[PDB]
């Protein structure tokens, strides 16, 4: 037998937003990330917590280095920025959709940078703020990021959904539509 895997420690610090991030990825999925402001390790799946631990302070220390380093890089490049790269957005259900059976809609935001985005779930044109969740900015093989936003929903033919995504690289917000269709 053979066990082929990849573990990645991904971290960044962004200006002028002053936002940092520290996470671990296993074969493309997030193991955990550290809530930089609260200094706490957030596991992607609750069950993971009983098998390991991670001292959040190590991530904070690394991000502190990244922040110092960013100033050095800005100085070295004479503050020459790059263009904003807009994301691709896709909406799909997590499981086969059956009327009246709870399901989850996934809004997959991909291939973009900088790692900052505004996302709004809409059900029948109205923002939904309950039963929603999101991942942090996840690494890709290249220099770009991806992210997942989720919405719990109850399949019905009277509804239609939209995932609206805004990014500094888009002319106008992008609104992706989704509706049940057996």
């Amino acid at each position: 037998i053979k066990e082929e895997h990849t573990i990645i420690q991904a971290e960044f610090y962004l200006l002028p937003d002053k936002r940092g991030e520290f996470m671990f990825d296993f074969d493309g999925d997030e193991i955990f990330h550290v809530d930089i402001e609260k200094s706490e390790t957030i596991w992607r799946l609750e069950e993971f917590a009983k098998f390991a631990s991670f001292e959040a302070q190590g991530a904070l220390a690394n991000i502190a280095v990244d922040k110092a380093n960013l100033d050095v890089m800005k100085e070295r490049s004479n503050n020459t920025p790059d263009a904003n790269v807009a994301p691709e957005v896709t909406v799909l259900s997590r499981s086969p959709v059956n009327l009246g059976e709870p399901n989850i809609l996934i809004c997959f935001i991909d291939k973009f940078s900088p790692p900052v985005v505004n996302v709004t779930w809409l059900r029948n044109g109205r923002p939904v703020t309950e039963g929603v969740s999101e991942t942090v900015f996840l690494p890709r093989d290249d220099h770009l990021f991806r992210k997942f936003h989720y919405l719990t929903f109850l399949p019905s033919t009277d509804d239609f959904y939209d995932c609206e995504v805004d990014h500094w690289g888009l002319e106008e917000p992008l609104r992706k539509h989704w509706e049940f269709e057996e």
């Binding site: 990244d66 110092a68 960013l70 490049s77 920025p81 790059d82």
Partner: protein
């Protein structure tokens, strides 16, 4: 309870600047990103491992540390000052050179206890899809969802004849929550005495899973 170890993030130094780099845009809101990916490549568990650290500034990968090299190497000129600075520090180099063991191998052993062995059996379902009068080629859908790991084989059969043509798929779809799904569709015009079957193989199963329509 084992503690996951983090890679050490090196401190960079100033000294000089580079003549106008690049943009590829302009007008847009200016942004500045310092991003680092420390990757552990396990070719066969901890037996064969390669550590690859990659540094990015905005949209550009500029520096790399490949454990097979043992030193930092510039990918673009923006990363050269760091390569030279860090490579001149024997203490830092030994520390980085040792992380394939102190971080990669160390963490794999921890994860090998619950991530490597994770298995979630897929739910397989089959169903037709068109617009009532099929008109053109008919479409049969084989839905395989809620599974992990990603390695899976989904095949169609026409009366025991594996269909190697007329296949339309979404490919492996990652849900972001440690589960995958895929839709493998077969273009074909049905016939009563002609049965279509979907066979699914996955490391969470003991025997293949099959469904007829």
């Amino acid at each position: 309870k084992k503690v996951i170890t983090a890679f050490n993030e090196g401190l960079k130094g100033g000294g000089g600047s580079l003549v106008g780099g690049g943009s590829g845009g302009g007008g847009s809101r200016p942004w500045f990103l310092e991003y680092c990916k420390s990757e552990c490549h396990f070719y066969n568990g901890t037996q064969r491992v390669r550590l690859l650290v990659r540094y990015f500034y905005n949209l550009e990968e500029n520096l790399r540390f490949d454990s097979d090299v043992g030193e930092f190497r510039a990918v673009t000129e923006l990363g050269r000052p760091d390569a030279e600075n860090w490579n001149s520090q024997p203490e830092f180099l030994e520390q980085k050179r040792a992380e394939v063991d102190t971080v990669c191998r160390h963490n794999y052993e921890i994860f090998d206890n619950f991530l490597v062995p994770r298995r979630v059996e897929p739910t397989v379902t089959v169903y037709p899809t068109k617009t009532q009068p099929l008109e053109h080629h008919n479409l049969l859908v084989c839905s395989v969802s809620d599974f992990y790991p990603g390695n899976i084989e989904v095949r169609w059969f026409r009366n025991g004849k594996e269909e190697k043509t007329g296949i339309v798929s979404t490919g492996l779809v990652r849900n972001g929550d440690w589960t995958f799904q895929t839709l493998v569709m077969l273009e074909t015009v049905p016939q009563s005495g002609e049965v279509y079957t979907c066979q699914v193989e996955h490391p969470s199963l003991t025997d293949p899973v099959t469904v007829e329509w």
